[PDB]
Amino acid sequence: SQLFADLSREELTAVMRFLTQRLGPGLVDAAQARPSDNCVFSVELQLPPKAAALAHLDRGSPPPAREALAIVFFGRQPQPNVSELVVGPLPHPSYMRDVTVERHGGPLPYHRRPVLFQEYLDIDQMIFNRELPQASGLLHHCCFYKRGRNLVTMTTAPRGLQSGDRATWFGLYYNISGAGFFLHHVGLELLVNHKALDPARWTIQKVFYQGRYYDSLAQLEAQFEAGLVNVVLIPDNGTGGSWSLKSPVPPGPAPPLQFYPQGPRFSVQGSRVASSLWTFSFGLGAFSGPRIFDVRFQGERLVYEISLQEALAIYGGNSPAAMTTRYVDGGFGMGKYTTPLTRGVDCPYLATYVDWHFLLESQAPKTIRDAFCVFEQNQGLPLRRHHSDLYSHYFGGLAETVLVVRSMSTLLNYDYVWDTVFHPSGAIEIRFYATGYISSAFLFGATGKYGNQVSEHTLGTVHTHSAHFKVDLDVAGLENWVWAEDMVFVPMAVPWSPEHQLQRLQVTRKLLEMEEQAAFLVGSATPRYLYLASNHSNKWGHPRGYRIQMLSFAGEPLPQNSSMARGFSWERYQLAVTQRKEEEPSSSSVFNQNDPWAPTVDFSDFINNETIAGKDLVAWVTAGFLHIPHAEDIPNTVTVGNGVGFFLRPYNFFDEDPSFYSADSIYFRGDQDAGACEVNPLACACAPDLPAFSHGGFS
Amino acid sequence: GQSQLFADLSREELTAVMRFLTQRLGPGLVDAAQARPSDNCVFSVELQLPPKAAALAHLDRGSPPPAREALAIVFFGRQPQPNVSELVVGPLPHPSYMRDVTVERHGGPLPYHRRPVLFQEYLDIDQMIFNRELPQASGLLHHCCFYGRNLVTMTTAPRGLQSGDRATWFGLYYNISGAGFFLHHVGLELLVNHKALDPARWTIQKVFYQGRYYDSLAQLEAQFEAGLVNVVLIPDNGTGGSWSLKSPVPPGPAPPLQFYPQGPRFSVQGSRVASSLWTFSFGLGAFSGPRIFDVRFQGERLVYEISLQEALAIYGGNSPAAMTTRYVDGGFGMGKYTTPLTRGVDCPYLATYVDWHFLLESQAPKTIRDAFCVFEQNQGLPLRRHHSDLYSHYFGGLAETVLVVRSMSTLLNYDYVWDTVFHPSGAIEIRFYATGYISSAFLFGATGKYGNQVSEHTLGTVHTHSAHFKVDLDVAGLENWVWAEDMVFVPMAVPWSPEHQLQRLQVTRKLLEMEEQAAFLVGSATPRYLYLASNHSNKWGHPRGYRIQMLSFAGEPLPQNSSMARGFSWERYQLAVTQRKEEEPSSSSVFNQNDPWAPTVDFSDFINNETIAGKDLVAWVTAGFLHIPHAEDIPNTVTVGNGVGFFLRPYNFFDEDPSFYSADSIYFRGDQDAGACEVNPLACLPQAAACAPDLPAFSHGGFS
Ligand SMILES: *[C@@H]1O[C@H](CO)[C@@H](O[C@@H]2O[C@H](CO)[C@@H](O)[C@H](O)[C@H]2NC(C)=O)[C@H](O)[C@H]1NC(C)=O
Ligand SMILES: *[C@@H]1O[C@H](CO)[C@@H](O[C@@H]2O[C@H](CO)[C@@H](O)[C@H](O)[C@H]2NC(C)=O)[C@H](O)[C@H]1NC(C)=O
Ligand SMILES: *[C@@H]1O[C@H](CO)[C@@H](O)[C@H](O)[C@H]1NC(C)=O
Ligand SMILES: *[C@@H]1O[C@H](CO)[C@@H](O)[C@H](O)[C@H]1NC(C)=O
Ligand SMILES: [Ca+2]
Ligand SMILES: [Ca+2]
Numbered sequence A: 001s002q003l004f005a006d007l008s009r010e011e012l013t014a015v016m017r018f019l020t021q022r023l024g025p026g027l028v029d030a031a032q033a034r035p036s037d038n039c040v041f042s043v044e045l046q047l048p049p050k051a052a053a054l055a056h057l058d059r060g061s062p063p064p065a066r067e068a069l070a071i072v073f074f075g076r077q078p079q080p081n082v083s084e085l086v087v088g089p090l091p092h093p094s095y096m097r098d099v100t101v102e103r104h105g106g107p108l109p110y111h112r113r114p115v116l117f118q119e120y121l122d123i124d125q126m127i128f129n130r131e132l133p134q135a136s137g138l139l140h141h142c143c144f145y146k147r148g149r150n151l152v153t154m155t156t157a158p159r160g161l162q163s164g165d166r167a168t169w170f171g172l173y174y175n176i177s178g179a180g181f182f183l184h185h186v187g188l189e190l191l192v193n194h195k196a197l198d199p200a201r202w203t204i205q206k207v208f209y210q211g212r213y214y215d216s217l218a219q220l221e222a223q224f225e226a227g228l229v230n231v232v233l234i235p236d237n238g239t240g241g242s243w244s245l246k247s248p249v250p251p252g253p254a255p256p257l258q259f260y261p262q263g264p265r266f267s268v269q270g271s272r273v274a275s276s277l278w279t280f281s282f283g284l285g286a287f288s289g290p291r292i293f294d295v296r297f298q299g300e301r302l303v304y305e306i307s308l309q310e311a312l313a314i315y316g317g318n319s320p321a322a323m324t325t326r327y328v329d330g331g332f333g334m335g336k337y338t339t340p341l342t343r344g345v346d347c348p349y350l351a352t353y354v355d356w357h358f359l360l361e362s363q364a365p366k367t368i369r370d371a372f373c374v375f376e377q378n379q380g381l382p383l384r385r386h387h388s389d390l391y392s393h394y395f396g397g398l399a400e401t402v403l404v405v406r407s408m409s410t411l412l413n414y415d416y417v418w419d420t421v422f423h424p425s426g427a428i429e430i431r432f433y434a435t436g437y438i439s440s441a442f443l444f445g446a447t448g449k450y451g452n453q454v455s456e457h458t459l460g461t462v463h464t465h466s467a468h469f470k471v472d473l474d475v476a477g478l479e480n481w482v483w484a485e486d487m488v489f490v491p492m493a494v495p496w497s498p499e500h501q502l503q504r505l506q507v508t509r510k511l512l513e514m515e516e517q518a519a520f521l522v523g524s525a526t527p528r529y530l531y532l533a534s535n536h537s538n539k540w541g542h543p544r545g546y547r548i549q550m551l552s553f554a555g556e557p558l559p560q561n562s563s564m565a566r567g568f569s570w571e572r573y574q575l576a577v578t579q580r581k582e583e584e585p586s587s588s589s590v591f592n593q594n595d596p597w598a599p600t601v602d603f604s605d606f607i608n609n610e611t612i613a614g615k616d617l618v619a620w621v622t623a624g625f626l627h628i629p630h631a632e633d634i635p636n637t638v639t640v641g642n643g644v645g646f647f648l649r650p651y652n653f654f655d656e657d658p659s660f661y662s663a664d665s666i667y668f669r670g671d672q673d674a675g676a677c678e679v680n681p682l683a684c685a686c687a688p689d690l691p692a693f694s695h696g697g698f699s
Numbered sequence B: 001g002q003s004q005l006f007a008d009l010s011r012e013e014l015t016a017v018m019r020f021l022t023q024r025l026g027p028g029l030v031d032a033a034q035a036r037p038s039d040n041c042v043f044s045v046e047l048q049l050p051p052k053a054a055a056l057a058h059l060d061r062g063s064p065p066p067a068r069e070a071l072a073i074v075f076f077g078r079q080p081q082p083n084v085s086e087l088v089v090g091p092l093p094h095p096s097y098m099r100d101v102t103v104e105r106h107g108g109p110l111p112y113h114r115r116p117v118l119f120q121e122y123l124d125i126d127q128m129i130f131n132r133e134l135p136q137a138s139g140l141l142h143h144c145c146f147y148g149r150n151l152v153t154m155t156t157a158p159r160g161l162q163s164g165d166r167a168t169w170f171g172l173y174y175n176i177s178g179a180g181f182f183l184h185h186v187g188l189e190l191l192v193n194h195k196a197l198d199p200a201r202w203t204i205q206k207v208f209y210q211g212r213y214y215d216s217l218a219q220l221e222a223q224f225e226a227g228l229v230n231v232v233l234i235p236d237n238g239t240g241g242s243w244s245l246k247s248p249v250p251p252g253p254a255p256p257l258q259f260y261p262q263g264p265r266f267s268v269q270g271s272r273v274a275s276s277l278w279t280f281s282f283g284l285g286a287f288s289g290p291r292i293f294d295v296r297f298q299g300e301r302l303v304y305e306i307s308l309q310e311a312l313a314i315y316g317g318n319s320p321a322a323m324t325t326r327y328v329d330g331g332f333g334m335g336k337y338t339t340p341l342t343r344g345v346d347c348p349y350l351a352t353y354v355d356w357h358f359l360l361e362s363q364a365p366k367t368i369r370d371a372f373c374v375f376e377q378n379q380g381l382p383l384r385r386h387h388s389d390l391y392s393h394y395f396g397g398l399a400e401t402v403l404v405v406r407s408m409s410t411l412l413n414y415d416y417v418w419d420t421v422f423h424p425s426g427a428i429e430i431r432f433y434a435t436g437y438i439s440s441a442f443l444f445g446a447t448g449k450y451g452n453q454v455s456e457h458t459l460g461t462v463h464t465h466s467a468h469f470k471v472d473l474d475v476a477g478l479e480n481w482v483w484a485e486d487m488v489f490v491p492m493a494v495p496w497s498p499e500h501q502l503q504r505l506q507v508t509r510k511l512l513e514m515e516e517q518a519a520f521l522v523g524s525a526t527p528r529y530l531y532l533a534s535n536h537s538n539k540w541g542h543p544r545g546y547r548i549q550m551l552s553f554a555g556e557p558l559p560q561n562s563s564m565a566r567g568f569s570w571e572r573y574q575l576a577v578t579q580r581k582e583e584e585p586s587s588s589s590v591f592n593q594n595d596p597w598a599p600t601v602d603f604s605d606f607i608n609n610e611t612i613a614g615k616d617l618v619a620w621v622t623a624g625f626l627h628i629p630h631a632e633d634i635p636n637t638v639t640v641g642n643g644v645g646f647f648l649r650p651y652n653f654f655d656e657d658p659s660f661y662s663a664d665s666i667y668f669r670g671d672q673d674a675g676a677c678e679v680n681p682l683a684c685l686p687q688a689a690a691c692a693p694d695l696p697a698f699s700h701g702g703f704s
């Protein structure tokens, strides 16, 4: 019942025509736009309000209007703004409202605007045509200069030092064919100022070569020709790992393949997955990325919403690009930068794969093929098991099979894997792996307070990753409270021999009444059992709870003292529980990246000393680690050990383990024929006949 | 050097050591399965691991292998001062000698009460409970419990309150057919004193019924018939979950099954597993449990030994049984209590399964069928992957497949799953799940400071699970140090706009020089990068490291203040790194369970202020969680979320990710046909390369 389905291609074209016809002429296609134009940057699903949605899904009411949200760069005017416009209803839009002010209390400063694909292209024209030839002598002598065809540019982080700046540090790298350029930094770094609406007016504020700072490329080339700059010649091709992805070893016998002996045990219709146990809807926001809604275990709802909010990456280093860099990846877009899943590599070969349609930086809706995969996975583990050789002879267990939804977001070098996994015990696991290439610096000098040499001439820069999740649990209805259970030892005299002492173990329950009590900072410890719960109880009279259980190796957060830190105040928390308000739909924003100093959304604002005793609650989970890159990250960072996320786990929510009622259960007694088919289902063509491999392709 | 030094004893070898001991132990030597306290007894015979010097000498430098010997534990009960003794017996397979290492190892005789409780001993206790004692309470027992064939006993933990005690609290439970009796405690608990060598002399120290203490079952029945006890009728049958394991739902369509399209890609020969990438030996200690030795990635050794050392379970509760209970399961035995893996449940259906032979509390070697399973598992995840739409058009990834060894130890109610999993990146994951049934109390009174109601009349008692692992890494040779890498922010002026401040991120490396510095307590925080390393370095000049990365939600440890805490000192640590000594083989002992007050091994002794700069090092990793039982543990505790253990991860050990050279890797350009077979191995699985096997007909390893 498809309220939460990302927009169809029809629905996008429809909103795009509507916007065209009503936004004034002189409306330029975003992929070609200059700063001083008008521009549709984004069109995408605007999620409905929760009231109306549940009204419809639970109480049969009519659905809420299906609307879209378009971001429009209004560059052609005295005071340029960015504007968010709601456009509905679908599929025949008749209205368009400008929610900008009602939402962020004022206009959106034009510098918060994400850097357009055209803008990057215009910056590379200035760099390679006007600027770089001024240093053609150095670049011949260090990096095989040709007129800028062999070199290539990569963005950084927040752009400038202060609200309203738009000055970006750019590294230069060899333009490696068929493998990651990110490892071949050439040592040159340019602070480009591109705030102006007129690209002609763009300057080059600073330069960095090989340990030293200059004021222009002309000054650097003065100092080189004056023989005053020791230049080293950096190789340009090479072999293995640092240069390739292609294995030299020929393919061996084949890895284990999984198939479904008697057909799949789940279906995907549109945005809705359904199985014997689990029902839910799914999607990608363009900037927020993955999300699932209306998660229903055996037909009862557990969560209204679980959704990625933000990923973050804080670097340090020798060079100015590295030490400035704090990527707030929502400002690029986790959904925009989704990539095709490659069958049999990113997901089981036999998974069902679904496309994703989007309208971003174009006026055509485009489509990313195989963006999502959904599949059942046999884990190899038992979910549960007991073998009794004692007093009575029996065995009873159950191999865990798991249901899984996966997207992958390729933000330049990094490939983020997002997983939503659905256990047959009633638990939901959320997971986040980082693979892909490292972002690297040129090796020079004081290295080692800042990272590891990881190839010739390559410094693997130290950095943290963090990601933020919204968990809108509705545990047995809307009104939830949060409990914190834990443990304690209490010295006591042994009752039946009181001259003797015994350390008496005891549970510890405190009911958290206030937002501030449930806001938990990185660094401080936290209750071992922490769960959202209901007024209602299970058979045995305990409050029905879903428990959050995290998996994080937190990096130390950017210190509060920094002006920047407000653009990601969620980084400072492990976990926070909050009154769930419509005015507070998201934890970061697409506009924080390019101005964290005046944050377009500041998460610490949500924690504001209200009650959380019997309210519609939402948990916010931070997860992440520290990364000191090392030789085994070349060519890619591996998944092993880097899984982070959390478990949502039943806690007296049921009256017993629901897997007890599993169809795939197994039991037998000592006195039975354990290998007779009427006692044991395991005791019973040309099996998997496979789809011919396909690929979603490239840009 | 081609020998299998690390192989659990075969059955011929066990019979041989048994025969030898028989002939040479004096006559009047009784079979342990039928032995009384005052008898002589062979409790255990099992492989004695060789000394490291000699073993490597052989394995690396070609020298001859060290004498393969066995270690027998012998209960010497027939004498003025009864001892336990450990005897080495070799060489095999034709033993010619036997020495009594008891004194040489633990500085003195082994006090007889440290001995584990024999199967006969438990039976003699049950004879005293059901024949002599329990009928004195026959009135009560009719009224409440449908009265001694319908009831059944279960042990506890340390036995007493003081070194030398041997008095055990025993719960009484309905003798439920075909499902866990552990959930049906009837409310009666008997403190039995069985220290004496004459079972006739055994007493019943105290009694506990439904909230109240009494001095004997006779005085309980006085007060019952005097109408002075409010007695609670506890049902005897029931349905679903609290009573069954058998699902009422009929089998549906089949779950995913995994097979190897063109043969297996590993082999098990005896104790030795071998694959394209990983080569290692494996076994069970009878009491220690799981262990692997001589682990070699692509031919180079990473670890000499990884071995379970102890599991622990500290309980609390309303009732005396629960609040006393601290299991040190080594004292029962993780190997002894291994159980058959049930194919297609405990491991993949097509995994290769291996038996385990043992001689314990008998004179015949017996065999546990399907005790281990080894298998490759496709994980679904990529190990690694990158899709470039930027500047150049390519794709390069690799689905992670993994190699796995698994044993399962069923210690009465609990089924521990031990996993050792071998990633193709060079990492080694160690894992530990607990499923099975909960140990439960009768629900009564101020419950809730002590756990959760989990069925009618059943309290799920709170507890902690902790396990201890020995990790003897030999990173690029024997001489290792430990480094602690971490991070810091340093306020600074932005160099190009000094007016402006920037929070400067930096790496932090300190080299830990002393044992105490690398001993990290539960509760303390602890370096984010902690690794053992070499004098030697990789191509780029950083020291060659394997890094320990833990996965623990540790309970608070038993407070030091308790006399008992010495028996498991390792609980108090997350991690410790130690000079690896032969005198210090193991972290716990089979003899701690029944006397933690005077501990037969005390782990804190190992941490004693020596250097760990450039020595043969051994890390000790504790892992564990808190468990407040809850409805969803009925009938069994589930695995999901309760995986605990650690990763051993390369850290500038190689010059690059070795999976770069994988056979299973995948790459193609934008300008290529991604679905052509000469470009992409995956575009042939259909065409021809499928065909699921005919499966082996299901078998089962059976029961006692
Ligand atoms: C941002 O700019 C847009 C136009 O570029 C503003 O919207 C227009 O406002 C005028 C009156 O201010 C109307 O007559 C038009 O019909 C409006 N067009 C639309 C689509 O809104 C908008 O007011 C500006 N926002 C702010 C807060 O400055
Ligand atoms: C533990 O018990 C054994 C016998 O039960 C003792 O061993 C015997 O000791 C006598 C005299 O020392 C010898 O002549 C026997 O032949 C020994 N038997 C064996 C096989 O060792 C043992 O010495 C006792 N240990 C201690 C320290 O009490
Ligand atoms: C970079 O290299 C690729 C192929 O190796 C080429 O197709 C592309 O046009 C080059 N130029 C730039 C700067 O993108
Ligand atoms: C316990 O139950 C089993 C039935 O499975 C039976 O064989 C046995 O006799 C019963 N009695 C005792 C005390 O074990
Ligand atoms: Ca709030
Ligand atoms: Ca809620």
Ligand SMILES: [Ca+2]
Pocket (backbone or CB within 6 Å): B515, B578, B579, B605, B606, B607, B608, B609, B610
């Ligand atoms: Ca020592």
Ligand SMILES: [Ca+2]
Pocket (backbone or CB within 6 Å): B304, B472, B473, B474, B475, B478, B480, B580, B616, B617, B618
């Ligand atoms: Ca070592």
Ligand SMILES: [Cu+2]
Pocket (backbone or CB within 6 Å): A434, A463, A465, A627, A637
């Ligand atoms: Cu990283």
Ligand SMILES: [Cu+2]
Pocket (backbone or CB within 6 Å): B434, B463, B465, B627, B637
């Ligand atoms: Cu438990």
